[PDB]
Each structure stands twice: as structure tokens, then as C-alpha cells.
N, CA and C atoms as an extended XYZ file, in Angstrom:
312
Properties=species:S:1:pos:R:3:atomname:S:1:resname:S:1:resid:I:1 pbc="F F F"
N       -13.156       75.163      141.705 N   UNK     1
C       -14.584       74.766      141.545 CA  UNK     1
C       -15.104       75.038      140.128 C   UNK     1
N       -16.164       74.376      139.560 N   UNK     2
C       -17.122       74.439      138.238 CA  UNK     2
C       -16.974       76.015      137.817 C   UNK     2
N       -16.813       76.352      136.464 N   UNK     3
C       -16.511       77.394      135.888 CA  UNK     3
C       -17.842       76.975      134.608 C   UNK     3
N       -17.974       78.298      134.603 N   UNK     4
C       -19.543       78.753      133.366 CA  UNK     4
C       -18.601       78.739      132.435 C   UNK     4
N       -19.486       77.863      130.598 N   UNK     5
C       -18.805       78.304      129.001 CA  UNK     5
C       -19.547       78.628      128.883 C   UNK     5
N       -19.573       78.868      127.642 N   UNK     6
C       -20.679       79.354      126.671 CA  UNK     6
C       -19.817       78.972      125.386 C   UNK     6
N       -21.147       79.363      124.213 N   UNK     7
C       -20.438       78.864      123.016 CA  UNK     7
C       -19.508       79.490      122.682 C   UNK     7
N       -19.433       80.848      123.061 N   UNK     8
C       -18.480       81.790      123.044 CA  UNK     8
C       -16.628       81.273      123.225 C   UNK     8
N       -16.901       80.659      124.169 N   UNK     9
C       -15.482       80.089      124.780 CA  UNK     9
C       -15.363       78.874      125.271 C   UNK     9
N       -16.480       77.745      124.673 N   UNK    10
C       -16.385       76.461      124.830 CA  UNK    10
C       -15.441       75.422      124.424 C   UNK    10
N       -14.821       76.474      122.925 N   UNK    11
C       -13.694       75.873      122.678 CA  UNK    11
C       -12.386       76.295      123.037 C   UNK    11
N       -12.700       77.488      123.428 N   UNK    12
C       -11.003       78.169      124.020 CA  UNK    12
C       -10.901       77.003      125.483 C   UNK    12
N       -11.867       77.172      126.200 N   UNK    13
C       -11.758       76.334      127.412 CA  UNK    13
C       -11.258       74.726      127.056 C   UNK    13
N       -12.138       74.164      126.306 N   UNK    14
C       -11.537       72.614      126.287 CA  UNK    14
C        -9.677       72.452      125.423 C   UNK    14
N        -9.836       73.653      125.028 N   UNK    15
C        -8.186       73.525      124.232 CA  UNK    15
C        -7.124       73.902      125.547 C   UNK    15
N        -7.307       74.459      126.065 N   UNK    16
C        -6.636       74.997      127.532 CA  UNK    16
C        -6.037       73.999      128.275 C   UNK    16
N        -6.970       72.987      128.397 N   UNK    17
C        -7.140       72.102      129.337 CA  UNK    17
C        -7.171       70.637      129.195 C   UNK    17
N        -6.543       69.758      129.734 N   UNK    18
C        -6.619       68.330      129.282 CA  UNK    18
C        -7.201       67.378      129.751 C   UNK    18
N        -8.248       67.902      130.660 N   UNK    19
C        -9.676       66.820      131.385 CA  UNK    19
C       -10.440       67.889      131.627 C   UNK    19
N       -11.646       68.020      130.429 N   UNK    20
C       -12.491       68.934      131.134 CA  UNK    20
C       -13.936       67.854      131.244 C   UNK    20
N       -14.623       68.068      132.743 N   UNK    21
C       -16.065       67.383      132.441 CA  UNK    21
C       -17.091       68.994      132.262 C   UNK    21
N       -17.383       68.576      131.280 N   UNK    22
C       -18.586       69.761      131.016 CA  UNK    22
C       -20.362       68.805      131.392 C   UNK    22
N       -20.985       69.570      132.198 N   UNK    23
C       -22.547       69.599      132.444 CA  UNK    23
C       -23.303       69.942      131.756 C   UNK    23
N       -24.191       69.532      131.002 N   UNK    24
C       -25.241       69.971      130.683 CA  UNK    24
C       -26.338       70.453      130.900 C   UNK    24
N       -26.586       71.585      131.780 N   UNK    25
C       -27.850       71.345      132.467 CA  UNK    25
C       -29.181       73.072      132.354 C   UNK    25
N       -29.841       72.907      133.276 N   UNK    26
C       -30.710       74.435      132.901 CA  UNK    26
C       -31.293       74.181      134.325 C   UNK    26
N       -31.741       75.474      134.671 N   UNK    27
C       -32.525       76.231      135.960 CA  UNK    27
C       -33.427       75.302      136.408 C   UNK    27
N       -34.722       74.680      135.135 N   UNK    28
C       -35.952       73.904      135.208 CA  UNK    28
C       -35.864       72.796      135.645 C   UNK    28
N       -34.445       72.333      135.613 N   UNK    29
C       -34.184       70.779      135.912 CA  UNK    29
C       -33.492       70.570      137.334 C   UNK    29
N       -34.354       69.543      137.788 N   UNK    30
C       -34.573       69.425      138.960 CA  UNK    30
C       -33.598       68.007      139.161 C   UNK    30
N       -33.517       67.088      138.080 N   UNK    31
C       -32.572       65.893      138.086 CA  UNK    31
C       -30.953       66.778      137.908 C   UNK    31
N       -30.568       67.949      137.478 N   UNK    32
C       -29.665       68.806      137.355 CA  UNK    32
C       -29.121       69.542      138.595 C   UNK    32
N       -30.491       69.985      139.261 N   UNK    33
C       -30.023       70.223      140.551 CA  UNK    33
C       -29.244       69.439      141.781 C   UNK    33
N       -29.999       68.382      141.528 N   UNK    34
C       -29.185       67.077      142.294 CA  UNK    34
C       -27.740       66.839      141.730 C   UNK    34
N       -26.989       66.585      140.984 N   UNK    35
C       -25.959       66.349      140.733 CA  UNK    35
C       -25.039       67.716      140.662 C   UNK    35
N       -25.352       68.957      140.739 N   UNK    36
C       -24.650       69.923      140.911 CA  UNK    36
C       -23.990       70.165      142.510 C   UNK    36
N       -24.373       69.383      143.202 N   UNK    37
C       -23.328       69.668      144.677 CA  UNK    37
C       -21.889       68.161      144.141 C   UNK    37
N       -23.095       67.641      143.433 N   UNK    38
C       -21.995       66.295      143.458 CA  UNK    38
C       -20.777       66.674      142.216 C   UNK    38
N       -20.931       67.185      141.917 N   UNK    39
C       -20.045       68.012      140.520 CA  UNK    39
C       -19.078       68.613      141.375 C   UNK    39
N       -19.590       69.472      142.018 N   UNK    40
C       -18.702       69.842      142.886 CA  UNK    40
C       -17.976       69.130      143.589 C   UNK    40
N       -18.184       67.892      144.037 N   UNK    41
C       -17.421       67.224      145.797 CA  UNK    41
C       -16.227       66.980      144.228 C   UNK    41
N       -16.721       66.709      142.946 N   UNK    42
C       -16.346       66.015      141.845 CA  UNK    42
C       -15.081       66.739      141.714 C   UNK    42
N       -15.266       68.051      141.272 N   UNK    43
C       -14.215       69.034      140.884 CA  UNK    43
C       -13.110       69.174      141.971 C   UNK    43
N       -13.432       69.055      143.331 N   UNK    44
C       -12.157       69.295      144.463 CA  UNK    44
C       -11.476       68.328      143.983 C   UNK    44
N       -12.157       66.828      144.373 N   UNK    45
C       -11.436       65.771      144.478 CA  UNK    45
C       -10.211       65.672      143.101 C   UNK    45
N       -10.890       65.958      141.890 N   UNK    46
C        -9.828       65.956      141.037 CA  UNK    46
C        -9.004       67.294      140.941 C   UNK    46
N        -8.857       67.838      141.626 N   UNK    47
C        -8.362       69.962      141.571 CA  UNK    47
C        -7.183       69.364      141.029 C   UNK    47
N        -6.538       69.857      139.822 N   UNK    48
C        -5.571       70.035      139.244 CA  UNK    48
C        -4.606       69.026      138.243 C   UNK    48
N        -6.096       68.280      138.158 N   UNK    49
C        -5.938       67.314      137.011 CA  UNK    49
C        -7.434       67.415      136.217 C   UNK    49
N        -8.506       68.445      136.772 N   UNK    50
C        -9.357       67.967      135.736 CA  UNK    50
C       -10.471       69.370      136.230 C   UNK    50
N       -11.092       70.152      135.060 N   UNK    51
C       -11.563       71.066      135.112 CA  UNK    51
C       -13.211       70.500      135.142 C   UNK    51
N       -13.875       71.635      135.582 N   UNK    52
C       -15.475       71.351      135.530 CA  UNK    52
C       -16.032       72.520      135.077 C   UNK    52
N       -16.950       71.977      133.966 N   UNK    53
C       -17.363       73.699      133.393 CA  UNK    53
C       -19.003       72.931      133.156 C   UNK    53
N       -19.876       74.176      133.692 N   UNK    54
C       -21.178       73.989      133.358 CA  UNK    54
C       -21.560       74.634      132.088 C   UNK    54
N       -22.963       74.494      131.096 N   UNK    55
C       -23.101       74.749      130.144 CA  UNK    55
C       -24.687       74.845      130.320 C   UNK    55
N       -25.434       76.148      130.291 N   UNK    56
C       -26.345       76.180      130.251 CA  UNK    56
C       -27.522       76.103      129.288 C   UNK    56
N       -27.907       75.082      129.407 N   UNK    57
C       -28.769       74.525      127.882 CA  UNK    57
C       -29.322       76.044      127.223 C   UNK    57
N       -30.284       76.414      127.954 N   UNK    58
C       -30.675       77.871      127.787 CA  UNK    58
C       -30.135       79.067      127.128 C   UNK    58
N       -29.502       78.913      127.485 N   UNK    59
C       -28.149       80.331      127.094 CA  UNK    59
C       -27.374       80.074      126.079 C   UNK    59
N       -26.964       78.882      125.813 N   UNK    60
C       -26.625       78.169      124.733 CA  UNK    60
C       -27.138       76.880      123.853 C   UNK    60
N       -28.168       77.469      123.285 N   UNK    61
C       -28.442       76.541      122.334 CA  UNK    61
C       -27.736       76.010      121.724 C   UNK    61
N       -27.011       76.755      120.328 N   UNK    62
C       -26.384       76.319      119.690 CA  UNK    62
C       -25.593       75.152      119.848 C   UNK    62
N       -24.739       75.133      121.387 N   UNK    63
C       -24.026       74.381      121.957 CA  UNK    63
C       -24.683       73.156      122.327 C   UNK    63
N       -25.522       73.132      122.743 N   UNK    64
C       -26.536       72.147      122.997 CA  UNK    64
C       -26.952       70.974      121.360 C   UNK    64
N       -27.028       72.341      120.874 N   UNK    65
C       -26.916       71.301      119.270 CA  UNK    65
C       -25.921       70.706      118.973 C   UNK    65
N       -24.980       71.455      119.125 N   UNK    66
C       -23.616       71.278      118.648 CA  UNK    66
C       -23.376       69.543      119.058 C   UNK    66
N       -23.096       68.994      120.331 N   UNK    67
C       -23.688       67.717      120.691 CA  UNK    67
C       -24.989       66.810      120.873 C   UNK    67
N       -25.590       67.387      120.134 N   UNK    68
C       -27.011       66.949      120.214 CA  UNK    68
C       -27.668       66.661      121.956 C   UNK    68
N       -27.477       67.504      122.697 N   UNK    69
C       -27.732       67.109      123.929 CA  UNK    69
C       -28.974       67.690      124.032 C   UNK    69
N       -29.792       66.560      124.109 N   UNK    70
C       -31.799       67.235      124.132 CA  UNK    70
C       -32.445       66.572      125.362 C   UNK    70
N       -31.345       65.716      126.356 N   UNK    71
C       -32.096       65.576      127.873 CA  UNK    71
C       -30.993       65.508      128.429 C   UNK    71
N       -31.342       66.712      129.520 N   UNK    72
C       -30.625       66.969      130.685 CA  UNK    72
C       -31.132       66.328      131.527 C   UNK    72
N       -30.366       66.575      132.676 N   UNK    73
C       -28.931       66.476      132.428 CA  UNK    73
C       -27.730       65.404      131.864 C   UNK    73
N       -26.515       66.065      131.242 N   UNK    74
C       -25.784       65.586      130.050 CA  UNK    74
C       -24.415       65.468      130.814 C   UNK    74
N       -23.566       64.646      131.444 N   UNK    75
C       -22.070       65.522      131.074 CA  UNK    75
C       -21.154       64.681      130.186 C   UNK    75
N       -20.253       65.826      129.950 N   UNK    76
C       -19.836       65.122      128.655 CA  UNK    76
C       -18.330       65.333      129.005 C   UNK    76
N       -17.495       64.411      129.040 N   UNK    77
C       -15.703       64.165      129.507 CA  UNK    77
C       -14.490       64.689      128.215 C   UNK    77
N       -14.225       65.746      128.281 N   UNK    78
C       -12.873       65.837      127.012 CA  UNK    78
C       -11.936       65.799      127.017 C   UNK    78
N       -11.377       64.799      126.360 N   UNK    79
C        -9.610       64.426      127.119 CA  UNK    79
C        -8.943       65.150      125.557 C   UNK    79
N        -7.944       66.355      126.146 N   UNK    80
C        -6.816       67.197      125.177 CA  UNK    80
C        -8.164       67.532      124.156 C   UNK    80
N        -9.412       68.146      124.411 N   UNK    81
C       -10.243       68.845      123.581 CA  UNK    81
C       -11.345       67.970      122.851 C   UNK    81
N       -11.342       66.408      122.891 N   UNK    82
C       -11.875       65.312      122.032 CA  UNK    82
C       -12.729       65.022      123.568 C   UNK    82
N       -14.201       64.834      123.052 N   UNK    83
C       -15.107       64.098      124.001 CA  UNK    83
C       -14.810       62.580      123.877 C   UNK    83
N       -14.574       61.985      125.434 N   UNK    84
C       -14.468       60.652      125.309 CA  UNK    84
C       -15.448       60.051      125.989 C   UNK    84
N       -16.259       60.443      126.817 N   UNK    85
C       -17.481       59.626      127.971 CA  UNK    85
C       -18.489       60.470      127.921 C   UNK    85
N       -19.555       59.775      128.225 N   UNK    86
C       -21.007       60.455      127.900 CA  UNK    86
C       -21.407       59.772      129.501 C   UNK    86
N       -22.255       60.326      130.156 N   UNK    87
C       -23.246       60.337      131.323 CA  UNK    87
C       -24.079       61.150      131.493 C   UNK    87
N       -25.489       60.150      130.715 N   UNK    88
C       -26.844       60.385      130.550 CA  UNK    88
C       -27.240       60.887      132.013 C   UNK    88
N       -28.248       61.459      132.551 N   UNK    89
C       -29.314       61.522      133.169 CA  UNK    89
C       -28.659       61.856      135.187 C   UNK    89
N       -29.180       61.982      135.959 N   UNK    90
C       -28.488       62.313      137.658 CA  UNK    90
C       -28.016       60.906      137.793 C   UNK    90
N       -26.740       60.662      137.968 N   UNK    91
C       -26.320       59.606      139.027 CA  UNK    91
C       -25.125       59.887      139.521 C   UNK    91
N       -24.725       58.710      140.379 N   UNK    92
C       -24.081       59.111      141.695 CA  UNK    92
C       -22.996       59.280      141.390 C   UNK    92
N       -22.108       59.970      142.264 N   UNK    93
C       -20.466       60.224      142.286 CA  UNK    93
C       -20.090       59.190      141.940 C   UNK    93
N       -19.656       57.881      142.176 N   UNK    94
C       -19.030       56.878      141.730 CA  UNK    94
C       -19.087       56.825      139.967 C   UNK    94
N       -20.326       56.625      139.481 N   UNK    95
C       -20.338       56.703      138.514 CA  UNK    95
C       -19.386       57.591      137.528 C   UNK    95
N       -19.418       59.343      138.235 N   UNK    96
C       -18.477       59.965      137.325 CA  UNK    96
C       -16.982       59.591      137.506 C   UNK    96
N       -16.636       59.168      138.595 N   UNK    97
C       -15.187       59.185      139.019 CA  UNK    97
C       -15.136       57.779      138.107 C   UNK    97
N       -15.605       56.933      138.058 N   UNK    98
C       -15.141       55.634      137.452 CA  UNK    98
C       -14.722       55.996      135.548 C   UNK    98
N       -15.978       56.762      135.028 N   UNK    99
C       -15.282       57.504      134.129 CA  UNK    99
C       -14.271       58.437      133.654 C   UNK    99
N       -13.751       59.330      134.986 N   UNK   100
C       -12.792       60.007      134.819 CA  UNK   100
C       -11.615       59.415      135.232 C   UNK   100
N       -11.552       59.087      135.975 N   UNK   101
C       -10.420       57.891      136.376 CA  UNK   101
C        -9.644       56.924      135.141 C   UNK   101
N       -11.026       56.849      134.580 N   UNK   102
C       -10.390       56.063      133.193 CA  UNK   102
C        -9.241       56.964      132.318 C   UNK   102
N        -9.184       58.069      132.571 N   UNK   103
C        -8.578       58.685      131.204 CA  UNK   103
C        -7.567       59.630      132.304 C   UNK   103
N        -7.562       58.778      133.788 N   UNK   104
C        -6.342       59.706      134.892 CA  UNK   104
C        -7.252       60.821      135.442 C   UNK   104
């Protein structure tokens, strides 16, 4: 299941790993809350081809700059450490799987 970064280890994590979807999201957001069970059904279905790490806008600014991500919720797809897919704003499971699927 979804594992917490921080800027601390945002890059140890995406070097680790060769599908990570990282979230963008914070406490206040309520379009964030909704897609966090679906992140989840997200993370089983792919278990052991593709990691899920949340990123708390809050706690990490910097990181938040770092991709310019200024509306949550964000997630952002990294195939071998390189972001390849962007998905703006809550939508549905299909949506992420059609992007991750793309890259296996």
C-alpha cells in the first residue's frame, strides 16, 4: 500500500523503484480525499510492478516547488526516476490505470 516521501527521500525512493505514482495532496483538500481510497484499490492492483508514495504539500514545500505543483490534487507517474504523466485534479480509477498501463 501508498508509502509517505518527503523531500528528504523523494529521490532515494523514485531511484529504488521503476513505476512510482506519487500524489500530491494535503489534509484541507477535500478533492484529495476522494481519490485517496482510489490510490489505494490503485496500488494493490499494480503490487509489484508499481509503487505509490504520497507527498504532502504541507510538509513539503520545497517539493511542491520542485514540480511546480500549486493545485491539488497532483499525481505525478516516474518511470526509472524521470516523470512521464501528469493527472491534474480527482478523477476516476480508469483514468490512472490508462496512464500507468502505458509505461506496463
Amino acid at each position: 500500500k501508498p508509502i509517505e516521501v518527503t523531500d528528504q527521500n523523494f529521490d532515494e525512493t523514485l531511484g529504488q523503484h521503476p513505476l512510482v505514482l506519487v500524489d500530491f495532496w494535503a489534509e484541507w483538500c477535500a478533492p484529495c480525499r476522494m481519490i485517496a481510497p482510489i490510490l489505494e484499490e490503485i496500488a494493490k492492483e499494480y503490487e509489484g510492478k508499481l509503487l505509490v508514495a504520497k507527498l504532502d504539500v504541507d510538509e513539503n514545500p520545497k517539493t511542491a516547488m520542485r514540480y511546480r505543483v500549486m493545485s491539488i490534487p497532483t499525481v505525478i507517474l516516474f518511470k526509472d526516476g524521470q516523470p512521464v504523466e501528469v493527472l491534474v485534479g480527482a478523477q476516476p480509477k480508469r483514468n490512472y490505470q490508462a496512464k500507468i498501463e502505458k509505461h506496463l
